[model samples]
Target: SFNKQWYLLANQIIQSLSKYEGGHIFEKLVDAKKQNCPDYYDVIKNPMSFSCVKTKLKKGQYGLPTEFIKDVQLIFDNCSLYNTSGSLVAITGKNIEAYFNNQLIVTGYNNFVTKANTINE
Candidate 1:
């Protein structure tokens, strides 16, 4: 069930990113999924040209912008996906933060696993 949810969440994130920018990034995400490729990380690992602005908040403390929060909620609502405990969800931007049932799970690169630290430990 986690895998299905994970994939769905991934698709939602890719869609959200595409909505924020244009369809190009979304196409890249779908391509990676179709190819069963690991390089999807490479494609989204870095910030887009538009995300060059720096935020003052520290990494773990960084919060989603109001616009992004609304978008996230919309995706969740339309998909009818529950934020279950330990369910991993990735949010991409200048950083990537994962959440499970409103709790922070892991935060790292848009691609590879960098820091696997969990809020509990």
Candidate 2:
């Protein structure tokens, strides 16, 4: 269910990332991207999913809301059975390499990294 949901969002993004471009909900949140948390990463990285239900899982489970889907990596690493970090789609980041290498995805990562690089630690 989470993978399908994530896929819907990802698919929507690959077609065009700017659909929900810019701080649509961050300014509303207490923090836009604080402590360099995964919450921050996802919001800024893929703002299209700003209000994505996956973002509101911060109830402090397994300890203090890691709230991560592969820590923002869309394809899971290794051949794990579950998201080592916990996520809706635990298998995220596995195929992400292709996307990062993707001209479409690269443009966004590069652009965001460049824009946020100033504050990224």
Candidate 3:
């Protein structure tokens, strides 16, 4: 079933991204006061984090694979919107985004095959 495939892909990607260097920054909700970025809420209307994605994934809130991927991309999008270009946060976001895209190409292909094969049944 596509449900199983989506779950597997989503979980694996989230886990891999969490273990990536500098990726832990995006693992949980951004604490504006603790992080000393009081302007965070003001600038970012929609905040997305890795743990948030995992929560949604577990809840099956994402009905399609594209939904989950969009949330994953939102983490980087929010980072880019909040931080200035060339800043450490932005750099980390860029690197992680690259890693994610590469993963999509690799693992995504496998999942596509799985989806295709399942369709034949």
Looking at model 1, residue 69 earns an lDDT score of 37
TM-score: model 3 vs. ground truth: 0.88
Q: What CA RMSD would you report for each candidate?
A: 16.4, 15.4, 3.5
Write candidate 3's Cα lDDT for 1-121 as tens digits.
7677768887998899999999989999899899999999999898999999999888878666667778888999999999999999999999999999899888873466456556666
Please tell me which model should have the higher TM-score, number 2 or number 3.
3
Residue 91's lDDT in candidate 3: 98
> What TM-score would candidate 2 get against the native?
0.27
In candidate 2, stretches whose alpha carbon ends up further than 4 angstroms from where it belongs are: 1-70, 78-96, 100-107
TM-scores across all candidates? Answer: 0.24, 0.27, 0.88
Task: State residue 120's C-alpha deviation in candidate 3, in Å.
Answer: 18
Sort the predicted structures by lDDT, highest score first.
Answer: 3, 2, 1
lDDT of 2 by residue, 1-121 (tens): 4333434434344333223233222123224445334554343433323233233432212111112333333222321332354553333333443443463344443443343345534
| Residue ranges of candidate 1 with Cα displaced over 4 Å | 22-121
lDDT of each: 0.31, 0.34, 0.86
Per-residue alpha-carbon lDDT of model 1 for 1-121, expressed as tens digits?
4223333344454444445533232222224566474554464443222121112111222232322333333433322222233433222321221232122123212211111223213
